[model samples]
Target chain A: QFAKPEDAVKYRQSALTLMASHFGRMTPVVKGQAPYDAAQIKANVEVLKTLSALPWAAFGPGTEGGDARPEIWSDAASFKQKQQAFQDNIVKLSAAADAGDLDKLRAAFGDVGASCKACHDAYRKK
Target chain B: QFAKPEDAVKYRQSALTLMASHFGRMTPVVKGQAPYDAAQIKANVEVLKTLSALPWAAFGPGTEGGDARPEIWSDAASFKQKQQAFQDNIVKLSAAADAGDLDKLRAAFGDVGASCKACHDAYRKK
Candidate 1:
């Protein structure tokens, strides 16, 4: 995640691959008239949690090269604050996934994605 | 908004285009130490509110044609219930944007995006 621009792409692609697969698995379980499988769902959520923080970490301040704006790196504390907020939602998602509760899963997943876009809305290029 | 599968793609892209541009405008306003222009901010947020409801409307029950899933079409009331929930969020965001309060803007935008993803999680392809 500390890598340069090109390496950043690689890290992001890897993260996306993992995220897509986990989401793909969970999607069907939630689409149900079919019976839910606790084992498979739990496994996917666990995998999702592990990869959750990787996306934000991959885009850490200096990692954007000169391409990134000065604003993001201007204040270290505030930047970390944003990243940690995103991280907190991911941890919450992890807990929800572990519980195998559908409502929690739905709310948590939506909030997790919200947290991601929230940070990106500020710091990242469109 | 009522069209076939290919039409769904076109509508979604147009919605994304409007959303991306509006978000692009608002990002800098919030990011800066400079003064926020109440007029431009209000204008963009106003445009966003009008555009927000277009996405789910395009993806209506039978609009997907053969490629669309049966689950979405089978029960119109339930599907509309979900769609209305998504719509409610857009309205909330509209109110926030109209107010131009920074904290409200952040929270509402995040929630609006979350609402979008909630339905997409079930019905749309990645």
Candidate 2:
């Protein structure tokens, strides 16, 4: 759907960048450094859920670059797997948020971060 | 919820930037230059709705900079009014998308774009 490679790059990066922001906003709460405002966290997670579905489609053939490593195209299966992992963690994170369980949210948040790092390590350039 | 001014700036800008991407993506469909995939447009509008709620919170006092003009902080009432206009247009856009009506979507999309430009002209830095 993108008219150019840069459009795809910008689209995907914008999505990922927003994903990082929404996901990172809860860091202080997860680390016990900020108050656990359950409703607020839940709302942000909902935004994150919507964002989780956006970046992938922009990764179609010839739409490359940004901080993306070539493995995203060369090792497509693993890239897809990592995307699934991040999304799966998001689901768990959402459940924790809905239940207002700080501890579970913390763990789920960590898992989601791990998924992000794993994908970045394998697919995103340093 | 932001710990620092820059975080808030980043948060709002990321949200706004992504809002532009999601909103701009439909331009072709609105212009009839590209096929109107109703489901895709609806999905993107859903994302836009979520994004519409995000930037305002980040505009709180002390969170200035980026492409934002000082008027955003100085003229709180007007800034807020513009925000409402944009969001109301988003509601109309969402309705059009949900109906899968191209003509309605085109008009709503233009209205939303006008709102965006109005706010940017008044509040964003040139």
Candidate 3:
């Protein structure tokens, strides 16, 4: 139905939130702060692998109401590069989780989070 | 730290939103309403398979905000069954997409969407 422009904005906001949700759940398990729930952590990372690519598409024209800044539309090239970096980090995180390497997973998780933060810092409104 | 119940609710909301975002994109392709993009469809389904499981765990107590209804906690058995149905349909949808069968994917997509609507009709706020 996405008949209106606001629909796209809301759609992406939800998608990004979902990405953050899984990222949050995996954080403690990767860091050894919580007992490892191998099944849950693995599942979370696998979802992240796919979700990492979906949100970018929703950032079409007229998605100006959400947390996204105007620069996302204006500086489109740089925004896309940041998105690619995020996706790349997610791929690495997926690999670490699949390998069941705690240290590697931890490092990869940090990298993923940092990439998210970097994008948010540049393109998301505070 | 998802130390509070509300955090879990919010987390799940985002995860579901992300799931819906991908679902929305794949809908047209599956139904032949839009031109097929093999790469995009496959990527979307892979993510759906993982995300289908993350939201159930976040339905802890005090998550009484957003679209979720209190019956989700009160009628736990029914809720679990509905959630399971959603999961099963997603699995089927995933397989359909993986096989690149347009007809099966369309059927499975309808089933998945129905399950989502059924659960929302019963358990979510308007």
Candidate 4:
């Protein structure tokens, strides 16, 4: 349990931003701006998948600051649905990275990004 | 290769912060303030391990402007050594977490925090 919800919220923000950072690294490779390096893709994907597992639980009551909307708690079911969808897309992206096919990775990457945007649109404040 | 070192640096900063965020979550448990949960420890350790692999590569030249000091590249050997030590400590901490023994986890957690502090003292600014 979170003794301090603010700490938990800040921690989640850091986790999500870090996940986004690693996700950002793969974008160039997916978009053909950077060369396809299997090792690099694999490394980033692993972090993404691991990080995707941890942030959702940090969004409890009183964790209200930093781009997180009140809807996260007030409308818990919808929030969980969006969160699960994001996790599913992350799984797909990880699988695609493991598959080592650039085309498939690209498609999966787009889906993951779309999923992130969708959730952010609904639950995160700009 | 990093087409933009700034981006790489920024990405690394995000990654490190994320790692620290998750690391922060376990401190209370390690300090005996929060109740121990095997599942939570495992999730955090997994993320820490995966994240440990990706940030160092992002510290190439031109990655200035962050809290990272110039010594990261200038004193390359020392930087690498410190980085490896941090990774090693993280591995040990993960193993201790896996054991689900609170006493062992607490000891390992201290060492990991010390390792991080050591590196930050030498390589990171502030």
- Judged by DockQ cut-offs, the docking class of candidate 2 is medium
lDDT of each: 0.61, 0.88, 0.80, 0.80
Q: Write the per-residue lDDT of candidate 2 for residues A16-115, one digit (tens) a residue.
A: 8778878877888899888889998988889899988889999999987888898899999989999999989999999999999998999999999999
Best by DockQ: 3
Which portions of model 1 show Cα errors greater than 4 Å?
A1-4, A24-35, A65-70, B1-126
Cα-based lDDT at residue A41, candidate 4: 87
TM-score against truth, every candidate:
0.42, 0.90, 0.82, 0.82
TM-score of chain B of each: 0.69, 0.95, 0.91, 0.91
In order, what DockQ does each candidate have? 0.02, 0.52, 0.54, 0.45
Chain A only: give the TM-score of model 2: 0.95
Off by over 4 Å in 3: A36-40, B24-32, B35-40
Choose the strongest candidate by lDDT: 2
Residue A32 in model 3: lDDT? 69
Cα displacement (Å) at residue B71, model 2: 1.2
lDDT of 1 by residue, A1-126 (tens): 132575554455445444544554565456665567766667667656655544555556456543344556686677778778867876776777688787777677777667667766776666
Over B1-96, each residue of candidate 4 has an lDDT whose tens digit, in order, gives 356777676667667766776677788898878899988788678877887777887886677667888888888999889988888888888888
Model 3 agreement with the true structure over A20-93: per-residue lDDT tens digits: 76688776676667887666677668767766776776787766777889999999999989999988888888
Q: Write the per-residue lDDT of candidate 4 for residues A53-124, one digit (tens) a residue.
A: 778878876777777899999999999999988898888888888878787889888988998999999988
Model 2, runs deviating above 4 Å: none
- Candidate 2 on B1-126: residue-level lDDT in tens? 467988788778777877888888788889889999999889889988998888898889888778889988898998999999999999999999999999899999999999999998998888
